A paper describes a structure:
DapE hydrolyzes N-succinyl-L,L-diaminopimelic acid to L,L-diaminopimelic acid and succinate, is part of a biosynthetic pathway that is the major source of lysine in bacteria, and is essential for cell growth and proliferation. All the DapE enzymes characterized to date belong to the M20 family of dinuclear Zn(II)-dependent metalloproteases. In order to examine the role of the catalytic domain of DapE enzymes and the role of the active site loops, we have engineered the HiDapE and the DapE from Vibrio cholerae (VcDapE) by deleting their dimerization domains. Removal of the dimerization domain in DapE enzymes renders the enzyme inactive, even though the resulting truncated proteins have structures of the catalytic domain that are remarkably similar to WT-DapE and AAP.
Two VcDapET structures were determined, the apo- and the dinuclear Zn(II)-loaded form. The two V. cholerae structures are virtually identical and superimpose with the average rmsd of 0.25 Å for 265 equivalent Cα atoms suggesting that binding of Zn(II) does not induce any major structural changes. Likewise, the structure of Zn(II)-loaded VcDapET is almost identical to that of the catalytic domain of the full-length HiDapE with rmsd of 1.15 Å. The active site of Zn(II)-loaded VcDapET contains a (μ-oxygen)(μ-carboxylato)dizinc(II) core with one terminal carboxylate and one histidine residue at each metal site ([ZnZn(VcDapET)]), that is identical to the active site observed for WT-HiDapE. Based on the best fit, an ethylene glycol molecule was modeled in the active site resulting in a distorted tetrahedral coordination geometry for Zn1, which is bound by the carboxylate oxygen atoms OD1 of D101 and OE1 of E164 as well as a nitrogen atom NE2 of H68. The Zn1-Zn2 distance is 3.39 Å. Identical to CPG2, HiDapE, and AAP each zinc ion is coordinated by one imidazole group (H68 for Zn1 and H239 for Zn2) and the oxygen atoms of E164 for Zn1 and E136 for Zn2. Both zinc ions are bridged by D101 and a single oxygen atom of ethylene glycol (in the molecule one, chain A) and a water molecule (in the second molecule, chain B).
Residue numbers in the entry: 2 to 138, 141 to 266
């Protein structure tokens, strides 16, 4: 039987959540998080479902952000495997969303599970901010404005978009907090770099620009933001896939980031 990482990633992949459809992916995540003490707030905007979940009431607020939607399969004649059927071949998990970004979502859930099991008494708070419209040419903005307008301000945020080139964690992208005009302690990037170095024994390359508008918005509003996720060589393409070993590594990097920040 699978690791909980692969088991959950497979589950997510099976749900045909073509933008902006969620197809029940968020309910899967919400069930896992409800079991860990998270309060959940579902929020629909336009044709999209979103949610915000939080565990803890104390500073800092650390958040995992991402989307459940995926882009269309493209030509089925080109697909070696059924696009919405998670298909394991030679150590790789094939399917729409494997890399962008249902793999990372499963890694976020199991990392928080493992962390909350080792550190039930963690500092700070853990949040999830999940949307289903990211591949569009709205949801993030609407959720973030809701949190701001009730003075619930994310301190630090990992966006699990697939940031990597050859191997998971070889690149991460760093947001500029408030566009580079708010003070920035570097506490998040230090934590993530620390985690990536433990796992890979190599520092990631850094980009300071170029991520998603979604993450750029979170940073502009005041969060420290880092994008860290799987290899992106196959995103939005036929025969999208992810190295399963890299999903185990990413889960560890997320758990280790949590240790450094909260544990
Ligand atoms: Zn994405
Ligand atoms: Zn995408």
């Amino acid at each position: 039987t699978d690791s909980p990482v692969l088991a959950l990633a497979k589950e997510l992949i099976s749900r045909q959540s073509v933008t902006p459809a969620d197809a029940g992916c968020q309910d899967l995540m919400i069930e896992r998080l409800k079991a860990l003490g998270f309060e959940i707030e579902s929020m629909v905007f336009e044709d999209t479902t979103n949610f915000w979940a939080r565990r803890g009431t104390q500073s800092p607020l650390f958040v995992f952000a991402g989307h459940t939607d995926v882009v269309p399969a493209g030509p089925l004649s080109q697909w070696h495997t059924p696009p919405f059927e998670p298909t394991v071949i030679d150590g790789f998990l094939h399917g729409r969303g494997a890399a962008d970004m249902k793999g990372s979502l499963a890694c976020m859930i199991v990392a928080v599970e493992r962390f909350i099991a080792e550190h039930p008494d963690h500092q700070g708070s853990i949040g999830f901010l999940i949307t289903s419209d990211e591949e569009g040419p709205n949801g993030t903005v609407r959720v973030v404005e809701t949190l701001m307008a009730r003075n619930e301000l994310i301190d630090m945020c990992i966006v699990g978009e697939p940031s990597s080139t050859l191997a998971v964690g070889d690149v991460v992208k760093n947001g500029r907090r408030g566009g580079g005009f708010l003070t920035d302690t570097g506490e998040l990037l230090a934590a993530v770099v620390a985690a990536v170095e433990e796992v890979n024994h190599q520092a990631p390359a850094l980009l300071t620009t170029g991520g998603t508008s979604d993450g750029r918005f979170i940073a502009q509003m005041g969060a420290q933001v880092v994008e860290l996720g799987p290899v992106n060589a196959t995103i939005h393409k036929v025969n999208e896939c992810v190295r399963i070993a890299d999903l185990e590594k990413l889960t560890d990097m997320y758990q280790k980031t949590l240790n450094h920040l909260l544990g």
